[PDB]
Symmetry: D3
Subunit: 291 residues, 6 copies
């Protein structure tokens, strides 16, 4: 961005205005995962972008996953896994590992990255201040609902405390573990949890960073990619899509149906993708709205 004429730099900065006005003082929940988490230039830029939102008076909330880091730690520890369908059964032991990795490893590096720009990030789980609870979930293998241990869905959210934390100028970085009604901590799918937090906080937008250009309807037809889609149309398309896009799309559906004005599936492999989706009309992501 050196040889680029100044008057076009001015135009790029000015074209941001309408979205600065749309998001000022608003909550934006961001699911962070995929390559945007593993490559150092992309993660450093993701951190700077969170600092950006905060220094525009926007209120980012970061929800993170970390599936592959968990299995690697379990393999390091020699913890033999049990599998039903494609799912590992989350025994009390896998959870102590899951929690320890998500919160004590993955969340910490993001906190430190963001905090390179200032005293902003704060890590939390649903355990802290009872910020959210979990309810045990089942999954379905070959059409049968089946138990795979201490996994669940976000049950209820301490909306008050949480919103406090962000008015103080803080960026929570959430690791998706929370207690159930009996105090038993469960692991929650990070995508679904992000949609739940977004809905409960009255978020203006939910962004889902993924390793895709965007929602393809008839993958892999190039002509099948779409910029925008409504819940009704997307819900009908849901049984058609690949394994990896189902949770991302399900989250977008529950968020937007829950009242979040729009959810976005954006490409985490693009540097500063969040700046592109939020402050530019040129994002390759796909925007979900109600209808």
């Amino acid at each position: 961005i050196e040889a680029l004429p100044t008057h076009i730099k001015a135009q790029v900065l000015a074209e941001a205005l309408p979205w600065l006005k749309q998001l000022h003082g608003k909550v934006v929940v961001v699911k962070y995962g995929g390559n945007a988490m593993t490559d150092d230039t992309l993660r450093r830029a993701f951190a700077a972008d969170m600092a950006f939102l905060r220094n525009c008076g926007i209120h980012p909330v970061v929800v993170h996953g970390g599936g592959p880091q968990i299995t690697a730690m379990l393999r390091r520890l020699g913890i033999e896994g049990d599998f039903k369908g494609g799912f590992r059964v989350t025994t009390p032991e896998v959870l102590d590992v899951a929690r320890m990795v998500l919160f004590g490893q993955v969340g910490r590096e993001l906190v430190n990255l963001i905090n390179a720009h200032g005293p902003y990030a704060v890590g939390i789980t649903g355990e802290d201040a009872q910020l959210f609870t979990a309810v045990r979930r089942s999954v379905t293998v070959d059409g049968v609902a089946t138990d795979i241990g201490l996994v669940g869905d976000v049950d209820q959210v301490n909306t008050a405390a949480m919103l406090d934390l962000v008015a103080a100028g803080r960026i929570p970085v959430v690791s998706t573990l929370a207690p159930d009604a009996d105090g038993v901590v469960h692991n929650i799918n990070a995508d679904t949890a992000a949609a739940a937090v977004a809905e409960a906080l009255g978020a203006e937008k939910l962004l889902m960073l993924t390793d895709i250009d965007g929602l393809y309807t008839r993958w892999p037809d190039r002509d099948s990619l779409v910029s925008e889609i409504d819940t009704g149309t997307l819900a009908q398309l849901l049984p058609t899509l690949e394994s990896g896009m189902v949770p991302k799309v399900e989250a977008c559906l529950r968020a937007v149906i829950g009242g979040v004005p729009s959810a976005h599936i954006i490409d985490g492999r693009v540097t500063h993708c969040v700046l592109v989706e939020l402050f530019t009309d040129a994002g390759t992501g796909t925007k979900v709205v109600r209808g």
Copy 2:
């Protein structure tokens, strides 16, 4: 900004970060005048840029002049002028006109322009809530200090009220008229007034929009333009410069010497010049710092 690749749009937006962090929650006083006031694309962009600062949680304060509009109104009214040196004598009558034009005409269009983006601008003079007072000033013709009527300098500033007004999320647009100790309203040079407001409010930056590329030391040598200069060096250069740059430079000197971290002389003829000077490293303006 259409055919421009997205990844370079992302970089333009990201390169803004460090200045967003420098100015967040800070007061920036802007002298608005020159062509940036008379051409409609430049004024519309100046207004949008004020909306921009506000929607980044920055606190712009706008000080405006309007010399040529005053003389035109005086000519329309058939008010014969009296002149000492190059100065019109500001009789009680010229002031009723000056005040009426500055506050009832020039300030109003800027307020309305800015307010096209939201309920932000509010017009004021030193008369309103006793926000600032004036002290009668003399000027010097042929080395003699001489009286030219009801003109003066900013005397004291109601720093408390003023800072209130901006925490409420408002953008004051100041017309440089204020009462003296006896209630007698004077007209204040808009440049000097901008430096006074900036100093009294603890402004982070003072920007002076002018009709120049920047400070030339040996005008019109092209090689004489400078990007940055300190107060000591600039003060010595002061007797050398053209008539039109003296007030702009004097303001920068008193502001920065008064503790304002930097004052900037930027080109009001560039669209969105303020966005360029604040969020980009490519401004043609000249930055003044202490030393």
Copy 3:
């Protein structure tokens, strides 16, 4: 008030009590116009009376007109007028003049007068902070609704901001210009605007200073003057009254019907008329209440 016995001075001050209790912490909107605006002893006393209300913890709001000052300025500028019925057509040019005179001249002298007693007054139009909007109005000539340019009625009122401004201890002085939904500033009849502001702010009282002893029913029978009247009775009488009293009475009707507890038509030619109408049982004005 020198030779007057002290014990009767004490009684005058004490008889104020019940109205001090009725208005303490309450909004009182005052239409200021007529002779109370043009003679210097009456205007100086009107200003002191506003200072009085403020220094009793009452919240005065001042709405002003200025019809004759506008036409004089238009005549000074050689602006040829166009007239339908008795109305001047408010072209874009007449408005730049109207706004400039109302806000840059008439409002300023009242602000300065009031501010001789302290940092109280602040001038505003509906343009400032989007405090109120306008909607274009027509008038009726010979029973036909007809367009006379950029004149209108108060459309909606930023009740929140406004009420803020007065809790801060400020006395707004309103010039009746406001933007329409498209940003186009209109001139609003000061009487009607005063009733609109009073209703929107939950004012306890609306006072209309006029050049009359009070409402005469069968002018000019001396026996026809009344101290108090209800909306129903007054509405029926409306088609009967002189040209000059119609707007004053219409305002009182819409205010009191809008829920303002009482509106008052008081004589602006009496020194300190507002002190008389508010803190004394001896006013010649006429009080309007609902029924």
Copy 4:
């Protein structure tokens, strides 16, 4: 105040302005005693005047005595008194009576009188919330310092709590009893206590209602009455005055020397004397200032 012309009523109300501005938001401590306490028209008007100050956003604080009511109750109870010089010795028994009469009788009627105008008054002693402490005082009989039991001076004042109570819009009515450092409640001279409260609260004025026209220097020469006097001059005159004026004058000296801008000895036998001393230039009282 019926046949009195309206324009002179207006002037009486307007002449109040400068003192409304001097006292707005300020603390005024009032010693209440003498006839102003015993005649029902004077007490009712004293109560209304406290309501007046409160409904002008002034902060009255009322300190009361009640010497004669105490002795009457002691006589009713058959409590034989012991006397040194002219002083009754305040045994533990006389105090239970003193406290009971001051706080449970005299303070209550004033509270109820004031509260006829609204929920304003609140009775207190130094015992409540530890609002002020006492220190045992001696008196001097025939030049010997002597002990007369549980009487004392205001020692320290809980300035914080107290000032709170008045910002809430309340009018404390103080009965001059307070604990010493050991919890032992003492009776405090109401005059001296009023000066102590006034000084500790940063009162703008202290008023002492007495049964005199004002301070006579050479009583009973009519020509000896004075409108104003300074501390130095008054302190020298102190040994000259009658028994009854010594405490009133001593209080004025300690208050004004303590920084209270002025103390006033006003005639409690004049209806609404406080309104006269505060809002009129015609008071017969005598004003004390420093010098």
Copy 5:
């Protein structure tokens, strides 16, 4: 509590937890009377217990009676009483005595006792700040409703002010006198008043200190004492009980039916009975709940 093993001291302190959690930040109204008022060890411990609740962030409110102290003062003053049934007729004179004794004597000693632990207590009646009003009540002699003078029931309660007073960290000590709608102060039965205050303040608990082990159903069968009872059952039992327990039980009924979660009749003759009823499972009192 010296030779007692430490590990059992630890258990006593720990068993308090669940009630500390139930009452934290909650209002607890306490009727104080009986022996707990007359013996010095019991009263000193009652005071310390109020200090305890306050230093746990609990909000005690103390309502006190004082029947026997009133009659003793009336006998000291030679005030001949008039009696209908078992009731003294409360003439205007008996009230001046009643008020003076309750507020100027009985309330003061409790305030001073409590305040030995800090600046907590503050005495009040319904007269102060119009905190509550009274309505004249009749009583029934031989089945006839009859007038016995200036006695009444709590009519309405200034819930706002009151709750303020306790958030400030204060412990009000209420003497049951209040004005009626016309300003005429009445004496209110302290038991009934305590139930009214408890209901109006949303108290978590109402405690009634009495001179009984607890509610006996078939007094004096030892086997008839009960630990807990519901309103329906207790209401039916009401006509059966002794004269002294009727008001205590009536208060418990109106409180719990008014929504107060539980009312308790506890033994005022046990040192620190309130600590026992609140923080221990071993109280001899009887708890009333709805049903």
Copy 6:
């Protein structure tokens, strides 16, 4: 605590008062470690005791270690250690493990335990919101200062944010990791960190739970145990004591010398030891004060 007479239960609860008054609204920092962390009855009671302090309006802050859990995890992961003197060298790898175990395992169980009583606990490190920084420390082996990797001391503490967090009613549970000036996270000795937090927060008390009866001067003479000691005396004794007591004593010295009123070494093996040390005069711990 069943057969124990009620009147002695009442005395145990009442004897707590003076310490409830000393600590109300005050910060108490607690080092938690040793057996109090490993046995389930002791940890459950430690959690309940934190809930206790919080439900008395006290502000507990919990600092925890976890040395043995770290080495066990390192052994599980097959991480070969390097040792200088008795110290493991904290390589970047040992820290990822240390942080993960302290924050993602040990801190979580305490948070969940405490949160069984309510939404109180919140886990943090110095990384979160930049709450505290670290400075690399060396240790001394055989009298030589030597480097053992990423270990350090608390450098500076974000006192503001922190104190906020506790006013909100939260109990922070601190894991002793923090960034240095360059963002490089270090592991901090939990004892020293507890003294640093206590000093920086103006804590009223610092408690150090250890596996000792208390400070023995001449261990293992039974007669050598002491209840209280001053800094000067204790500092001189420091070179004499066992390896395990040095850090506990050093922390007490720096805390009390830093202005913390008293530090306490209490026996973590006693159930509810904190309740015993704080609310009882029977603790076996040893209290440190300045002198």
